[PDB]
Amino acid sequence: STIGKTALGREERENEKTLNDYYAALAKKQA
Amino acid sequence: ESPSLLTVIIEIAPKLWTTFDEEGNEKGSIIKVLEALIVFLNAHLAFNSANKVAVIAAYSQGIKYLYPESTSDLKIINSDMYRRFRNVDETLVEEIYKLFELEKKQIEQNSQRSTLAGAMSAGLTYVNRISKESVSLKSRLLVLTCGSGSSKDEIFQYIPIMNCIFSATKMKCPIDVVKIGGSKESTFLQQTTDATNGVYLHVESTEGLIQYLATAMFIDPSLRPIIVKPNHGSVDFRTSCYLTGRVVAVGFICSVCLCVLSIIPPGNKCPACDSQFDEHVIAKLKRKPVVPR
Amino acid sequence: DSLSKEKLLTNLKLQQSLLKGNKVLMKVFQETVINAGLPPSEFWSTRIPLLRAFALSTSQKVGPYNVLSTIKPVNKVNVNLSREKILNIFENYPIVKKAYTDNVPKNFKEPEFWARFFSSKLFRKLRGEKIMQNDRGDVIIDRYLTLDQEFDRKDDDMLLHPVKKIIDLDGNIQDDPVVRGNRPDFTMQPGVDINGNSDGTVDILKGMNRLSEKMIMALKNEYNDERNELKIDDLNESYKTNYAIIHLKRNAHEKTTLKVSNQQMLQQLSLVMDNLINKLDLNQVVPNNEVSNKINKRVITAIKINAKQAKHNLEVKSTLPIDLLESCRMLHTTCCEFLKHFYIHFQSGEQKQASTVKKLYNHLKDCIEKLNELFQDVLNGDGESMSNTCTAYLKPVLNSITLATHKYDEYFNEYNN
Amino acid sequence: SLKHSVTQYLEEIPQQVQNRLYTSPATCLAIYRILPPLAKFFIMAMVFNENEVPLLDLDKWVNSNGKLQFQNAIKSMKSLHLLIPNKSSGTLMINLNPTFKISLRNALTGGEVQNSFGVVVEENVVSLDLLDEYSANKWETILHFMVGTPLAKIPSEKVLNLLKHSKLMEEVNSTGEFKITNEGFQFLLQEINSQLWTLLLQYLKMIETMDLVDVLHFIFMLGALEVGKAYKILSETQRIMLQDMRDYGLVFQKHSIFYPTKLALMLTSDTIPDGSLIVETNFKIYSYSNSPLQIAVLSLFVHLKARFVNMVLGQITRESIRRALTNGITADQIIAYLETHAHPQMRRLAEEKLEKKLELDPNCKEPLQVLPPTVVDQIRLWQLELDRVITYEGSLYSDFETSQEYNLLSKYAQDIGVLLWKDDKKKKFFISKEGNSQVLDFAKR
Amino acid sequence: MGILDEVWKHKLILVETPDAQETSLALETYRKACSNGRGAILLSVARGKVSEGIDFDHQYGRTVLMIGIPFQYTESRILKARLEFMRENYRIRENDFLSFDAMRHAAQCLGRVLRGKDDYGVMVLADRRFSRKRSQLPKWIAQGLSDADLNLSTDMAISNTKQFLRTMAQPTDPKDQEGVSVWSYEDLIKHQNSRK
Amino acid sequence: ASLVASIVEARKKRTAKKNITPYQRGIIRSLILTLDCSEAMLEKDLRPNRHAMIIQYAIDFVHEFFDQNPISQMGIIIMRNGLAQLVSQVSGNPQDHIDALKSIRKQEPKGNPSLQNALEMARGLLLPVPAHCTREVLIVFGSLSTTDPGDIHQTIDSLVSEKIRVKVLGLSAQVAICKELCKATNYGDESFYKILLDETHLKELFNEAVTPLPVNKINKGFTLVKMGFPTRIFEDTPTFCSCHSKLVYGGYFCPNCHSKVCSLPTVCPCCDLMLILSTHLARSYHHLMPLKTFAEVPTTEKFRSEDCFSCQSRFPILLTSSRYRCEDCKQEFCVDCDVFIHEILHNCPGCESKPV
Ligand SMILES: [Zn+2]
Ligand SMILES: [Zn+2]
C-alpha cells in the first residue's frame, strides 16, 4: 500500500600421487 | 510466565516413620514433614494465582487423593489466615486425619509391598487430565518418601518407575524426589530425577525442611532451563543382574526378553522367558582371549 | 559374485577407486597404512559396507525399454541423443550395433552415422512404423534391411518353444482337423490391397509383439504348476498366523553390594493422631537460624559444583595452535585405528590370529612411544605452556592403549607361564 | 503492560512509604505476585531463613543462558526496596526487608494477620443473579457515558470528576459536551484488567490529603477477597473509599456488609467471540455482537444502518471516519480495533491467500492481513485529507541589516528547535509562537 | 498419431495375430509381464481365438476395454440369408438377432476376468450404442451396471475406476462375508433347515 | 440413536483392542527404508505432491522409530531413474537419517522405479547384521509398474532365503508382484501389503511400522548378546572422541576399553561392544508384558465409586456407563485415562497400588 510515499511525476594432489606410487609398488610386489 | 501444576506424592506409612523415629531421637517427625509440606503448598499457591495443587498419599494399603477431595470440618489451622491457603490446607489435614484413622484400623493387616509406584502413576494420570481440560498448563511431580524403614525388595518397583520416566519425558513433567531416611541414595528415584530434568535431594534430619523445600524444590517449570539444579549425586543408569543381584557394567542380555545377566545362566537357558540358547553360540562367549602360543 | 567379503577385500581396483574420491577416508589411509605400517587387508576388513556400497552404485543397470519410440525427431529438426540412449539402442537392437562397429572408424564419423540412421528406413522399420516407398531413406543403411529380415527369422526361433496346453491356441484350431465351413469375411482377415498382397500392417503388429517378447526373455538371463492356478483360492481355509508367545516370569534377588512390631506402629500412630487433633502450629516450621545457615551452605556447596559443570556442558573452541591441533587429531585417529584392530583380533577366540595380535600389540606399544615423543617435543618447543593442555587432549586414548597392553600382558602371563 | 503499569506506580513511591506499605500481609501477598518469576524464586528462598546471603550465591543459581533475566529480576526487586543491599567485611551482602519478611511469613504460615484479608459474615448472596448483574451494569454505565452514547442514568460526580480530570473524555463548558480522545479509544481498546487499572491508578493520583498506603491496603486486599461471599466491616479512610469504589462496579452493597464482585477478583491476576465483525470491500460492517457497549464504540467511526438481535450491520463512510478523527482517534487504532475484532471467516480466507502466495513463491513471507487493504488505505488517505492544510502560529523575521545577523538569529532558532522556515536569499525566517520570546531575548543580547 | 508411444512407457504391447502359435507366445509373454510387475496390454479381437476360452483373471485381467459392439459384417450373403431364414421360421427379427449375436460376444469377453469372489476388475463398454443394451447383458452383469454408468465420458470413467481400484485394495472384513457370501459346513446346514 | 451410534462405533473400535496376547517381538531391529522417487510421484493426489508428503512423513517415522526402538538401526534407499540410490548407511544415529531425508526433499523425482534394484541393494545392506536382529525392508511404493533388469522372482527367493521381511505401502492400487513379495516373505501372511485411501490413513500406516514385528515360531535365533553400560563422566577440559575424532567436553566411558563415545546407544568404535543405558532396554518392556485391555461395565451392576480411581474425574451419568475396569485389580477407570494408560503409560495404577 503506497500511501506515504512521495507522489509520482517527472595439498590433495600430493596425497593422491603418493597413493598412486604406493599402489604401483603393491601391484609390482604381488606380481 | 505460565501457571504450573504441582502434584506432591507423599509416602506416609506406619512402618516407614516408626523406624525413622527409633533410629534417631526425633519423635513424631511426620508432623514436622506435614506442617512443612503445608507451608510449601501455600508457597506454591502464592507464586501465581492460576496454579493448582494435588497431594496423593500412598498409605500402607493403597493410594488416596488428599487434595482435591472427592465429592463423596475440624479446626486444626486458625481461620484467620488467607482464604485460598486455608481452603487447601484444612482439607489436606482432614484427609490426613481420616487416613491415619483408616490405617490404624488395619494395623494388623499384612502390607508387604510399598505403593509408591502406583501413586506416581496416578499423579501422571492427573497431570494428563489437568493439562487436557484447561486450554495451557505446566506440571511437576514431587515425591516425599521416607527411606529410613528398611525395604523388602525394590526390584518390582523398577518396571513401573521406569515406565513413569518415559511418560514424564513425553509431557515435560520434571519429577523431583526428596528422601528423609538412612540410605543416602535411592538408585531408582535418583535415575527418575536425572532422566526427567528433576531435582533429587536427601536430608537426614526432618527439622528445617522448609529451607530445603523453598530453595531446592521450588523451581517452577517456567524457569527450569535457566536454573542449575543443586543435585550432588551422580547416577550411572545401570541395572542389577537377574540371578546374582549385583550391578553389571558389562554383561549379557537375552535378545528375546532383554533381561540382564552378569554370568552365563546355569543350564544354558534364560531364567525369565525359558528360552533355550544355542550351545554353539554361547560357547563363543566362553572363549578366552587370544594370546600367542 | 563380486559383492562378497572376500572379493571386495581383493578387488584392489575398487579399493583404489573409492579411496581416490573420498578424502576423509584417504586422510586415515595415508597416516595408518603408508607411514604407520598397518596392512592393507586389515584396513578394509572393518570397512566392508563402505566397499560394497561404492560397488553397488556402478554395478546396476536400468531395465529394458522401447528406446526408439522415445526418440521424437521434433526446415531443420533437432533431435537430442545421450550416451545412455546410444548404449540402449545398441542393446535393444543388435543390427544397429553391427552397422555401427564396422563403419565408425572406417568411412565416416559417428555424427554422420546417426544422422544417416534416423533418415534411413531402418530406423522407421525398427520403430514399428510402416515404411513408405516415397521416402528416399539412406543408401548405406538400407543394405542391412535384408540382413534384418534374417535376424527376425533367427529371433522368431529364439522365442518359439512348446506352450502349455492351458493357453495353447494352436490346439484349439487343430482340435478338429477336418472342419470345413464358410471362409470368414474380409473383416476377419488381414488387410490386403487391390493386387491381393499384404498391406503390411501385420508386420508392425509382429514387430511390437517381438519387441515385448525379447524384452521379457532378456529378463530371464543367466544372472503341478497348472493345478495351483486353476484352484479357487477364496474357497480355501484362511491363513492362520503361527507367532510364538512368551510368558515373562518375574523374580530376582535384591541388589547386593530395628524391626518394629505392630504395637510400636500403633502407638506412634496414636501419638501423631493425638498431636494432630489437639493442635497444629505452622509457624513452628521456620528454622532456628542455627540450621538455616548450615542448610544454605550445604545447598550452595552443590550449586557451585553443578554451575562449574553447566557452563561448559562443530567441535568446541580450542586453545592450541592449528598446526599442533591437527597433528594431535592425526595421532588420535591412528592410535584408535590400531586399538580397533587389536581388539577385533584379541577377542576373536581363534588362536590362528595370534601373530596378528602380536603385530598390533607392537603397534600399540609404538603408539605409546609416539605419544610420549609428541609430549616431549611440545614440552621443549612450547615450554610446558601447551604440554599440559596437550596431555589432557590425548589422555583418554593413552589410558586406553596402555590398558590394552596391560590386559595383553596379564593374559600372557597366566597363559604362557 | 498490566504488571508493568502497576509496578511502575509502585516504584515512584518514596522509600519511607514503601516500608509502611508492607505492614499488612494482604498487600505483601499481592506485590509478591507481580515480580518476575526469578524475583519470586529468590524472595521465597530468603523469606524462611533469618540470615544474610551474599549476592554471588544468588548469581550461582542462574545458568549461563538465563544470565540476562538475573539483571531485570534484581533491578525490579531493588527498585521497590524489598531487597536491602548491606555491604560489610568487604562483601556486598544482601538481605530481605524485615517488614516484608514477617508479613510474608505470617501469610504463608497462618500467623496473626490483623484481619488483612478481612472477615466473613457467612451470609452469602447469589453471584450470578446479582453480583454479575450489578457490576456489569455499573461498569456498563461508566463505559456508555464514556463512549458518548445517550444513556438515562448518568454516573455520580465522583467518577465523572475523575473522568474529566484524567486525559480520558476531554470536556469544555463552551462546547457543553464531552468527547473521547486519543487515549480514550486506547482505553476502550484495553482488556478489562487494564481498563480497571487505569481508573484505579488515576484515582490514586487524584486524591489529596486519606493516606496513599490505605488506598493500596484496600485495592490489593480487595484482590484477596473471593466473590460470592460476605465480609463484615477497617480504616476510616477505607469507608469513604469503599463507597467511592462502589461507583466503579467493584463492590456491591445492599445499603454493614460489602460484597466484592467479578471485577474485584479480575484485578489481582489474569482471568464465536462477541464483538467479531466482518468488513467487506464495499466498506460495509457486520458485527456479530449483542451488547450496547460494543455497538456504542462502533458508532464512534461507523454509520450504523440497522440492528438485529444477533448482529449489527452498518457502513463505513467518510463522515464517520472524519467524526472519529476530529475527536483525536488515530487511524492506526481504528485498524487495530478492526483487526483484533475480526471474524474467523476473514482470518481463514486471509490464511488461504497467504498460502497461495507462498505456494507460488515461498521466498518472501507477506504479512497476514485479515481485512482487505483497500479499507486501510482509504482510512489513511482520509487522515491525510485532514492533514492537508498545515498552519503554525508564529512570527516572521525580516529586514536584517547584515547576513551575519540573519544567520545568527536563524541558526539559534534552529538550535533550540523553534525554526519552521527560512530563506537565505530573502534573509527571512519564521519561528513558532512558542519560541518567540527566546529569539527576541537572544536578539537583544 | 503417436498414441502407442505413450502406452509403451507404462505397459508392454502384445497383439493377437492370425498365426495361432505366435498368439500363444504373445499370451505367454503377456502373462509373464503381468506377474513380474512390468505391466502389459493385450490387444485382441472379440470374436477371435483369445475370446473363446482364455481367461484373464486376477492380475492377468484388471480392466476390460470393449472397443465397440462386436457386430458381424452386415453386408455378408451368408448372414443375410441366415437372418431371413430365422425371421420366417422362428419369427426372430433381424435387428434382434444381430444385437443378440453382438452382445453374446461382448458379455463373453466380460466374464473372463473373475474367477472367485476375491477377484475384481473394471468392465468398460466403449460405444454409444451400448447404452441401451443393459437389459441385454447377463443378469449378474446387468445388476452391477448402475444407472449413472449407462452413458459416461472418458474422464468420468477414469475417476470412477481410480476410486474403485483404491477401494478394492483394502483388507476385506471377514464378518461382512462370513455367512452371506461364503458358507462353511455349519452355514450350509442352516440353509437346509430354514428352507425345509 | 445418533449418540448411541457413537457408542456402538466406540464398542466396535474396542472390539479389535480386546484381543491382546503377549506375542514374542523382535526388539533389536534393522530396518531398510526404501522410498519411491519416480515420475509417478509427481502427481497431486497428495498435497502438495506425493514426493513432498512422503519425505515429511519419513522424517516423522524416523523420529518415532528411534524413539521407541533405541537399540535398533536404520538405512535409507531411494529409487530414481531405474536405479537404487543409497542415501544413508545402517546406523543407530537418528540425526544422520533426518539430514539425509532433508537433502532428498529438494531434488525433483524423475525416472522409473526398480523394485529389483532396491531389493538387491537392501539385501546387501543387511548382510553385516547379526543373526539375532530382525532384517526388515519398508518400501513406500507409488508406481503401478516395475522396470527391472533381471528376474524379480529370483530376488524374492533370495530374500526369503536370507530371512528378510518386506512391508510395502502402495499409493494407488494393488500391484501383483508387490503382493507376492509381501506374502512369500511373511510366511504366507497377506496383511503386510497396505494401500492407503487418504492422507490421514497414511500417517497411521507409518505409525504402525514403528512397533516391532512378532516373530515366527519356527524361526529360532535365540542368543545372548554382550552389552555394556558405560558411566557418564564430567570432565573439566575437552578430550578427543573415539568415534568422530573431535573435541567434546564429556562422553560415556566404555567399560571394556575405556574409550569415550559422544552419544548412546552405539557400538564402541574400538571393542565392537554395544553401549546402552538401562533406560534404552526399559523403553521396550511394554512390548513384552502388554497391559490387558479394559472392558466396559454393563449398567445392570452397581458401580464402586463415583470418581475415577487414578484421576479423580467424576463419571458422567448421561444410557452407556462411562466406566472401564481393570480385571487384575477391578478398579473403574474413566474413558480418558484408559487411552492414556494404554498408549503413554504402560502400568495400570490400580495394580501397582494393591499390596500383596
Ligand atoms: Zn530371556
Ligand atoms: Zn564423537
Ligand SMILES: [Zn+2]
Ligand atoms: Zn569399548
Ligand SMILES: [Zn+2]
Ligand atoms: Zn480417569
Ligand SMILES: [Zn+2]
Ligand atoms: Zn489394574
